[PDB]
Design an enzyme around this catalytic site. Structure first.
Site, PDB file in Angstrom:
ATOM      1  N   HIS A 107       0.771  -1.245   0.000  1.00  0.00           N
ATOM      2  CA  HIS A 107       0.000   0.000   0.000  1.00  0.00           C
ATOM      3  C   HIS A 107       0.811   1.311   0.000  1.00  0.00           C
ATOM      4  O   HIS A 107       0.228   2.375   0.127  1.00  0.00           O
ATOM      5  CB  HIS A 107      -0.965  -0.012   1.192  1.00  0.00           C
TER       6      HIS A 107
ATOM      7  N   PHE B 271      -5.282  13.348  25.462  1.00  0.00           N
ATOM      8  CA  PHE B 271      -4.773  13.658  24.145  1.00  0.00           C
ATOM      9  C   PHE B 271      -5.799  13.424  23.016  1.00  0.00           C
ATOM     10  O   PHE B 271      -5.583  13.841  21.880  1.00  0.00           O
ATOM     11  CB  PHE B 271      -3.580  12.746  23.787  1.00  0.00           C
TER      12      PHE B 271
ATOM     13  N   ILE C 129      -4.918   5.244  20.825  1.00  0.00           N
ATOM     14  CA  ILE C 129      -3.937   5.867  21.712  1.00  0.00           C
ATOM     15  C   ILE C 129      -3.331   4.709  22.491  1.00  0.00           C
ATOM     16  O   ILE C 129      -4.075   3.923  23.093  1.00  0.00           O
ATOM     17  CB  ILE C 129      -4.535   6.933  22.601  1.00  0.00           C
TER      18      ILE C 129
ATOM     19  N   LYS D 197     -18.510   6.681  26.580  1.00  0.00           N
ATOM     20  CA  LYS D 197     -17.563   7.757  26.851  1.00  0.00           C
ATOM     21  C   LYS D 197     -16.926   8.255  25.533  1.00  0.00           C
ATOM     22  O   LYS D 197     -16.736   9.458  25.345  1.00  0.00           O
ATOM     23  CB  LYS D 197     -16.481   7.303  27.800  1.00  0.00           C
ATOM     24  N   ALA D 198     -16.583   7.319  24.657  1.00  0.00           N
ATOM     25  CA  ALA D 198     -16.015   7.638  23.342  1.00  0.00           C
ATOM     26  C   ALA D 198     -17.091   8.342  22.481  1.00  0.00           C
ATOM     27  O   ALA D 198     -16.803   9.354  21.819  1.00  0.00           O
ATOM     28  CB  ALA D 198     -15.536   6.363  22.698  1.00  0.00           C
TER      29      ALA D 198
ATOM     30  N   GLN E 193     -10.117   6.654  12.026  1.00  0.00           N
ATOM     31  CA  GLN E 193      -9.938   5.739  13.164  1.00  0.00           C
ATOM     32  C   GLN E 193      -8.666   6.151  13.919  1.00  0.00           C
ATOM     33  O   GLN E 193      -7.694   6.649  13.321  1.00  0.00           O
ATOM     34  CB  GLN E 193     -10.032   4.262  12.789  1.00  0.00           C
TER      35      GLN E 193
ATOM     36  N   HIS F  20     -19.489  10.167  23.556  1.00  0.00           N
ATOM     37  CA  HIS F  20     -19.665  11.495  24.071  1.00  0.00           C
ATOM     38  C   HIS F  20     -18.534  12.403  23.627  1.00  0.00           C
ATOM     39  O   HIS F  20     -18.754  13.560  23.289  1.00  0.00           O
ATOM     40  CB  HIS F  20     -19.753  11.460  25.618  1.00  0.00           C
TER      41      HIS F  20
ATOM     42  N   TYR G  44     -16.752  12.135  20.889  1.00  0.00           N
ATOM     43  CA  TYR G  44     -16.867  12.434  19.484  1.00  0.00           C
ATOM     44  C   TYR G  44     -17.946  13.506  19.278  1.00  0.00           C
ATOM     45  O   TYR G  44     -17.793  14.394  18.436  1.00  0.00           O
ATOM     46  CB  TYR G  44     -17.124  11.173  18.676  1.00  0.00           C
TER      47      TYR G  44
END
Lengths: 170, 170, 168, 170, 168, 170, 170, 168, 170, 170, 168, 170
Positions: free
Chosen positions: H47, H96, H87, H127-128, H84, H130, H132
């Protein structure tokens, strides 16, 4: 009346028929299964292989009579294995001795080989006898060498030397 | 009967094979997906021309109608075993060819390839096929649980075998 | 019983080329309506052995090519695939869609052992949305300005059906 | 009555004729020499090249009228160069404006491009004027940019934006 | 003027195949008389661009193939080559050899700018030796048991001619 | 006259080229060996399809008889020079086509390829050809001594040239 | 304390040692001969093969403990063959049950397989018993399936289903 | 200012290999946590020139590798891509994500000239979801039993943001 | 004794093999020409990495000194035969390793590869080697006449064999 | 000053080029995306080693610090034109090297490559760069509208040129 | 017993390169004294498996490279080969030629089973001619202006020996 | 004291330095730009090209002095072009005449060529004179043959024949 010539791509359908015939391949200790494609691809592979000479036999009419091959040609020992097939439709017309002589002439007067040998089933005594009449002598009796039709069978290894062939009459 | 012959699969037989391989009701007997473009079929045929681990045969009658397919696959060099599979085309099912063809496959396995064991898979929910194989000398060695997904659910299959010594001494 | 799905073959590519170069048709698949026969044929060749798709042509009893059905992005682990279908202009309006949608689901669920089939359909095609609902699909997404089509960004429904629902 | 479609291998003899015509290639600032083999090999090379779209123009009769191309398509800047040829036998039948519109529709409603530009000889004022009538505006006057028929000549670069094309009437 | 030499072409290979599989003919070149058409054609292909040889077919005015003439092992520095010729059985005894030998020398000396042409000929073919002498070749070697031919080792003459002698 | 046309060499013209390339009397004018199998010709044609350093042309009359060959070779990117060579087929020699064809080659060199200098080689022992070229605007810039081996001896050749500025201002 | 991770090129010397050990390979019914080069070339071949997952087992110290493999992964039937080797130096430290559980967790909670099966010598009753304790059930007793140490031996085929593994406790 | 995105490089593959073989991490991307270094490196090679993706590694001021951000399935016509992010465990909980999400959007919208960025996130990770939402993404789909994860099928939100919203 | 081990030939053993293959006195026992560049050796090793028709082994003692070479070649899939050949390095000849190594080769042939027949060739003019093989269970099945050219003349060789049933029942 | 040198880009300069190509603020001056893996850079470098349509140079001072990059691209064989582009590394911006480097590029274009016209693109919103180029002899020939997408919006660029005759006669 | 012939190996190519670029040495083989190491090494590679030649390096007991011996144009049917030998300048005049010539003949006749070995030697090197005569070779040809060497065409003897003579 | 030897891969850094030096390449009418990679790839390409001989010149110390080349070697006409470069650091040490003699000796006594020719700028009268002293004679004065440093320049073509070189003194 009979002529040996190099095997050609247009003879492959004839070889294919022989190579898939159980009763013909049994004389060569080979499995009687070969797709045209396997046959043709192996032909292609070996075009320039100097360790073999494959010949087709024709009559004057240019009927295809059979096959003669010299294989495993070794150029230090100067030996090769001889094998022959006469098509079923031409068996018993008395051509074997002539074609054995042709093969030996080629071996010894053209390729300058020292020794030709062959393998023949111990249970094919008529062929053992024909070979002896043409000058071959038994040098081995190989025990259970090949599995043929449900059991292990013995074979004779027989040979003839260039010296005998060329000089016997002198 | 003696009219039937087994011979190597050839490139000119692939349209017949394409037909069987895209027939849901034929492929179900082999637990395979009934989808194969001619190009996939042909390219895989090309890929396996020299593969010594399989022998694929086409069945013909005296008039050369294509009757079906017989294959020995996963042929192993040490263990001297192979898997037997068969397809009789729909129009020829029920004619009495199956027993003959099974015996031909075993003869090839045991008298030419010198194998020790032939096994097969057949659906538990096809008891009459199981019975036929039993009458032909196969014995059940396994009952594989939910082995294959067929028609929306998992099915069990019998694994059945026969040995060279039994076939050759009957 | 009249209509059948079978694998796409090389001899069917002229039919596909025609649909692939038709603006009206390709708008239903959110695809650009340009594809030389060479691009089509070369991509066909490239994907012969690709296990992640199944492309089918639809034939009637007379062997007329009626349309195309595809299962794409088939996933090994999640056991999901996207379904898409085209019915040739000369054969729309004959009521074949329902039959063809059901055949695609039968294939997915009874042969490929998939768990989920999803599809995308333009919000501006409420008739197609309704048809898919009748066949058991339900909306799971309303994708905002997902595709540029005829000079503007359009919304599409994502709809799905599970194996468990189809088989019961 | 006129349709634009993707260039195909069977249209190459038509393109070859145009590509070897001095008076047609002069409008594209190209040398009027191309063997069929160069043409065909370059076609093959670019089959999957996403940076160009080549179209042939047909009438209802399916006479080949000419060629439209979008080249150097850039997908961050969203711009492409437009070039068109109408065969000598069809020049002056009033098809240019229609085909320019087709190209712009494709660019702006299908490929979602932001800007289309073109090059036109300053000494071809009739074409400069046609282009202006179709919405293009001069953004450059390139000095001695191309050697054409024995001397360096100036060319206009002209453009149109998706916003203007789509929204002018709103 | 009737006979011409021209480059060997693919359409002439059946003629060559016939001579190459003829025992009597190939004995004059000290070569084995076996060559499948595939070996012949593949070697032809391999040597298309080989600068070290020039193979010619001989044609009469009617375009009948009469024979073959070859210049081989052409050397860049020493400016030498080996000449060999075959006249088909159906055309021997018509007196064409002299003409053909001279054409080969003309080619070598007036076109290829060679300094020396040599050849090999069986000691047991005194008629051929005499013919080559008449055409200006002289013996420079008598090679002892050089080639195995029909069951025995045979001797061959090596004969040569220089550019300077030919052009004067 | 205006009846003659130059066009790119194509694969279907190679039998004509093969004929000239195997003609001793035609090849002598180019100081080349008159031996080339069709396979050598074709494979070299294939090799040079995309070579930008040459332009090979075939000459045709109004009825499309093949008249001859014109080539610009060793075209250099910096120095803006090329070698001009021509062949008029035997049956068309002496008809008055040569001057026209030379002017066509120069027009292509100077008005399309934008070259600075065209040069050629011609035998000193062919003074009438030298004269013709002089009448066409070429001037002798060299007299190469024993440059080429032809027909058993070395021959001298004139090197003659013409510049773009002279051709374009006549 | 034990972790399964993907096989890497730097683990090949470890695998090579196992693959050439007669007493370890006998548990997998494989011939104990493999040059590093055969091993490495086969590794390379199968890098992207989605039909297998090969894992190495490490302890916290990062000693190499053994090998776990899932092979013949079929994505319509959702079945795979499981095979494991614990190095001689780590045999009898009680790690097998843990590693069998890891393999089953991977199979059923990550790869979403329906069925895992294995083969075990009938003459290795301790392993048959361990497998039964871990949930496998005998589905076959394969007669003379494999030639191992001078004679044909029988093997059990055993299996476990995703449903049982995941839902037994519910 | 401390954190930077830069193109993925060959020397970063050991870092990626580690994340790609971590079960907990790969569960956030709905991917199988098995990848030999050879599969990883070979796919990387394959790629290199693929215009449909942009893979980035995140570095702090000291050049510690913090995570990965990818823009995939970049579409030429529709001008959409999927975002995507991962961390690394040793760096989660430091706040972060917000910075990194905004950097990915800046890249997409100010450099790649995209019209839409979408992402998928587990319904079981509120939580993720929220986070976003705080960064401007909105839900456009609730995909039912979309992915098999740890023995069961799970639902995921599809969320999006448009260029027009981001730049204003 | 039990100190000796057979293992697969590896690339790091090739310098040892190169030494034996270029030693006239070692190669004479195999009827082979004692000339082989390291490059020929290595490239042929590479070529045969996946060849299933041979098994090449290196012999080592407890301290890993390289003792010699054992090979099974021409392994046949149907006939279940192979040729056995051995080389003991000069410094280790006469130590009593040979009988052990012959038994190891037969054990591998008969207990792992499941072959039916192992044969070998040995010089008639080396009667003590013939005797050793007889003591090890081989029996003479042929006396091949002038089979190999060695040291300026042709020599005869014995062909000797042993069957699986005899080895396994002793 | 005379301290600066232009030389061909080499493989050992690619880490320097990688740095510039991944710097958003440097790439903005070329209207290019500031993302390029070392592998993309290197493989494209490899691809274009023999491409005659470009000349890439690295700028060095007397102590061999790398100063910047100069490139002539899209060099055309007929029209005798090329695009000039430059990058001065951040730490060397504002030192007075730019005018020198522009003159070096023009000298190479006009005194070595024998080009007719050099053009460049520069942002309208960078008027001081436009001014510099004007002082160096370039003249505006176009003002391209919304040509490039930069930092979230489309920007206009000047197209500026200089001819060989002007440079050589100053 | 001190001197041995062994197969040429890759590590010996620097030695060969030196002899191959030496004008005086290569004049004995009628070869051009120019060969880059790359041409040498590439040709070596090409001929690894070529059965028609055997190239040997000569070593003393201390493993110093003394020279080279080659058997070339080995013919399968005729059983002939050409022998050529070079002794490095630093080792000529030590009487090794005789030993080396005999070793080459032993190889040809006792290992390769050849019928005839021939060689070429400059007429202007009567000392070498005499040495070959002492070793059993006899003249069979005097080739006129066969090779261009230092500005002029020179004559060479062709000399031979048969297996039958050597072994008796 | 000076020796000519074949160019080797380890001399490429020396050639690279010369090939990128404007004032050295001007003597050969070549563009002074060549990446190491272009150089090395072209070297590789031409390893077996019999139409050129490239030599490096060394002194006894084995300092690299310069380069001599024979190119376009034609084996029917027996002619080649000679070109030489002496490195800047060794210019003016009186080596040219010696190296010209070496080249001529090689040409005429080793390669057996008939004619050597060279090109030399008319504006380099010192070199024209050196060449005349070494036996070359002017055969052409090529008008505006090469573009060098901003303008077209004339060059002498000069030659020497094998006959003169070898026989002048006789």
């Amino acid at each position: 009346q009979l002529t040996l010539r190099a095997l050609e791509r247009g003879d492959l359908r004839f070889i294919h028929n022989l190579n898939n015939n159980r009763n013909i391949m049994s004389y060569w200790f080979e499995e009687p299964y070969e797709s045209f494609d396997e046959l043709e691809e192996l032909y292609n592979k070996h075009i320039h292989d100097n360790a073999e000479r494959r010949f087709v036999v024709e009559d004057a009419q240019k009927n295809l009579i059979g096959l003669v091959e010299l294989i495993e040609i070794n150029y230090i020992h100067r030996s090769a294995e001889f094998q022959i097939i006469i098509a079923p439709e031409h068996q018993g017309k008395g051509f074997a001795r002539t074609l054995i002589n042709r093969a030996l002439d080629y071996s010894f007067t053209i390729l300058n080989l020292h020794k030709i040998y062959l393998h023949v089933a111990v249970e094919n005594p008529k062929a053992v006898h024909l070979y002896e009449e043409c000058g071959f002598v038994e040098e081995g009796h190989l025990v259970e060498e090949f599995f043929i039709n449900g059991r292990y069978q013995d074979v004779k290894r027989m040979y003839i030397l260039q010296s005998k062939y060329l000089n016997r009459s002198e």
